[PDB]
Structures are given as C-alpha cells and as structure tokens.
C-alpha cells in the first residue's frame, strides 16, 4: 500500500495473509469461517498446491502472537473464464481445511447481495484497501498491515482520467477503478487479492479485490479492482459445493 497508514491491530479483522511454502503470496478476505476470497492471478505460478496456508489475525509479520490462526487451503476455485497472465475475472474462492475461530481479531467481511452492491455500495465514495504489499512501486513490502482510503470511479470517468498507455488491458464490466491519479496513494502488487471494503450504515461489505494497475501510484492511473458484485451468485453457489480431491478447481462462470 503506497501512501496509506498502518491498520491498527484488529481493525482490519477480515484481512487474510496467504502463504505458499511458508512465504508471503497474497492477501485475501475472510467472508465466513471457512471461505476466503482472493485474486485469481495470485495462483498463476503455483506448483505446490498442497502448500497453501491462510493466516487470519495477522498484523506484524515480524512477530507472532496469540491472535494468529493458520489454516490449510483445501481448495482454490477460479472462474474457468480466467486466463493466467491476464486481468479479467480476477477472483478466487478458497476453502479452508478447518474453520477459523471468530474472535475480536478475526471477523469476516460481509459478502453483499448483488443488487444492494450495485445500486447502493457502488455509490459510497470511499472504501478501504489493505495489505502487506509494496510501500512504493517496486519497493520493499510492509511488515505491519497497511490500509488506505480510496475513492471509487465509474469506468467512463476512469478511462477519461487515465493516461493513454499502449497495450493497456481493457477495464471490463468485471472491474472498477478506485484511487488517485496524482501518484500519491494506491494499492500495489503485494496487496493483490486483498479487500476493497465498503462501510455502509454501520456494516462493512466486500465490494472489490486488489487486482491490477499500471505500476503503483503512477501519475495518470488508478488502481483496478475486481468488481465483486458480478460474482455474488457464482460465489454463493460454489460455497455450497462439496470438496473435490484436487486443490485447484476451475468452475464455470457465470
């Protein structure tokens, strides 16, 4: 997170730290005791599928405390429409082997209904994005969980305010921009899969997933997030599914 602040311990209770072979991989968002939402691209280079761990209650990566809960990732479900190396349909639903225990430091973020999300949450200006990613484009990553307040834009505005770049990905209906074009604040690579959480009338909901961007806090550019509202039915359906032998599952979408 570039230009944000440390998220006070326990104040981003739904943030997940994903590890592969014990090393930092990506962020994620707890949505209930068993399921975590992250970004599909986070699994593009995975070979040891049985070595994925989800850590809840994490804050300071340099210190362990009694609030941290680690669970084995039993399943990673990605839309079959997603193509590795690309940006569209950048979402993954992970099933934890055993449920985490809900505590003052481990709380799920509400997955909202689609219409409520499209007609109400989508018009709440600011939302928070977090993670232990880069503190500067191409810089070192964070030891303490970072959080940033970012304003959302309708895609027409995003396109109109974004600096022209050859080869740039299309910002589809499955994404949305949020952030600042002024080079000062933005999420970054290491924040991938983390939440874009929206506060509304006293409750926090999952509206986006840290997905991609041109660098991080690059002038003339905004962060691009997976539009979670487009996947509500897909996520709910899948959460009611039974486990399969393999870890990775490419499920049809819609």
């Amino acid at each position: 997170i570039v230009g944000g602040k440390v998220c006070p311990k326990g104040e981003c209770p739904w943030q997940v730290l994903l590890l592969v072979n014990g090393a930092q991989l990506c962020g994620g968002t707890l949505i209930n005791t068993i399921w975590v939402v992250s970004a599909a691209h986070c699994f593009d280079k995975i070979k040891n599928w049985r070595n994925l761990i989800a850590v809840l209650g994490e804050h300071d990566l340099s210190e362990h405390d009694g609030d941290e809960q680690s669970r084995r990732v039993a399943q990673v479900i990605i839309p079959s429409t997603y193509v590795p190396g690309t940006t569209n349909h950048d979402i993954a639903l992970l099933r934890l082997h055993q449920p985490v225990v809900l505590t003052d430091h481990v709380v799920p973020l509400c997955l909202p209904e689609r219409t409520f999300s499209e007609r109400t949450l989508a018009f709440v200006r600011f939302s928070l994005v977090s993670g232990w990613g880069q503190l500067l484009d191409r810089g070192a990553t964070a030891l303490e969980l970072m959080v940033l307040n970012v304003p959302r834009l309708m895609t027409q505005d995003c396109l109109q305010q974004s600096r022209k770049v050859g080869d740039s990905p299309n910002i589809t209906e499955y994404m949305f921009c949020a952030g600042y074009s002024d080079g000062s604040k933005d999420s970054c690579k290491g924040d991938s899969g983390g939440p874009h959480a929206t506060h509304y009338r006293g409750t926090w909901y999952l509206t986006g997933i840290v997905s991609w961007g041109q660098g991080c806090a690059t002038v003339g550019h905004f962060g691009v997030y997976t539009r979670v509202s487009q996947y509500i039915e897909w996520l709910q359906k899948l959460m009611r599914s039974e486990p399969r032998p393999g870890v990775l599952l490419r499920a049809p979408f819609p």
């Binding site: 018009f123 200006r125 600011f126 304003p151 309708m154 027409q156 505005d157």
Partner: protein, 191 residues
C-alpha cells in the same frame, strides 16, 4: 440509450434545477448529485423529464461545490451511459432574484426606501431564509433613482427636494462576485 448533453444549472435564490437534453425516446433518466468527497445521491428516479430539482440537496450547504450526472436507462428497466454536469457552487453562482421595493416614506426632508426581504429556498429552523440571512455582508442593495445609492441593509435614506416626486428602482448585488454580480432591476416605483 444516448447520453444526456448540454447539462445546465438553472439557479435563482438557491432554487436549483439541472436541465439537459434531449427529450427521451425509449429511455428514462436518473440524476445523481454529490460533493467531491461525498457519496452520490440519486434524484428524479426514472424520469421522462429533462430537468431535475436539486434544491433540497444543495441547500444543505450552499457553499459546497456539487457535481451531478444524468444516467440514461433503456425503457423497460452494468454501468449506464451518463454525462457529468459542470461543477456548481450555489453560494457563488445562484442568480440573485428580482427585488421588490417594499415601500418609501418621506421622513423629514429625506425619503426612506425599503426593499422587501428576498426569500430563498434555504429553510432554517422551519422558515425560509432571506438573501441577507444567507449572504450577510456579502449582499448589498443598490438604488437607481431620479442618482445612485447603496446600502448594507435593505433600506436607503436619501436626500430629496421639497415636493419633487422621485422614481426608484433597486438591484440585489454581491460585490465580491466577478460574474453574475447582480439581480435584474426591480419594477420602478414613483412617489
């Protein structure tokens, strides 16, 4: 759908209506309004009108800067086609309404001319606030009579000649403005 165009702010004494084009053909509109850091509020839901009263939103804080956008929706019911409006700061841009000379009294060898309180759409603690209530020292009234007088209140005390019956007309003025500094002249009233 076709996106709205020529979005225009029509505002007088804070009565603020966003107008646009074109007349709808198999499409309806919805308007949204917000301040730079505030959330978007929806108004005039699925209207076939080409205007939308936003008075109630802007009077919450007349000194704020608002931006609006008009969404186009196909008839019958994914981000819609839309057009953003120019920014609008009510305090700095609302037109001053045409004033009315309330009365004129020959007090002694002078004439007192009183301008009727101009009421606005801002309604403090149950009632409609006058222009002076809203602008305070930023508002002055000017008098063209037969030659020119200016006041920080709503009253003018001018010197007149014995038995000469004068004619007057007044204007609301916000001197600090560079543009849209004054109202239209009030109707002429003579002794």
């Amino acid at each position: 759908t076709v996106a709205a165009y020529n979005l225009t702010w029509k505002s007088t004494n804070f009565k603020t209506i966003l107008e646009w084009e074109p007349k709808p053909v198999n499409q309806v509109y919805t308007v949204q309004i917000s301040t730079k850091s505030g959330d978007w509020k929806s108004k005039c839901f699925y209207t076939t009108d080409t205007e939308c009263d936003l008075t109630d939103e802007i009077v919450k804080d007349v000194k704020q800067t608002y931006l609006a956008r008009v969404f186009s929706y196909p008839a019958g019911n994914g981000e819609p086609l839309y057009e953003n409006s120019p920014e609008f700061t009510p305090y700095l841009e609302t037109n001053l309404g045409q004033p009315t000379i309330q009365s004129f009294e020959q007090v002694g060898t002078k004439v007192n001319v009183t301008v009727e309180d101009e009421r606005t759409l801002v309604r403090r603690n149950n009632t409609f606030l006058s222009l002076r209530d809203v602008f305070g020292k930023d508002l002055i009234y000017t008098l063209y009579y037969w030659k020119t007088a200016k006041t920080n209140t709503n009253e003018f005390l001018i010197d007149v000649d014995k038995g000469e019956n004068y004619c007057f007309s007044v204007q609301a003025v916000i001197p600090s403005r560079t543009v849209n500094r004054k109202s239209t002249d009030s109707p002429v009233e003579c002794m």
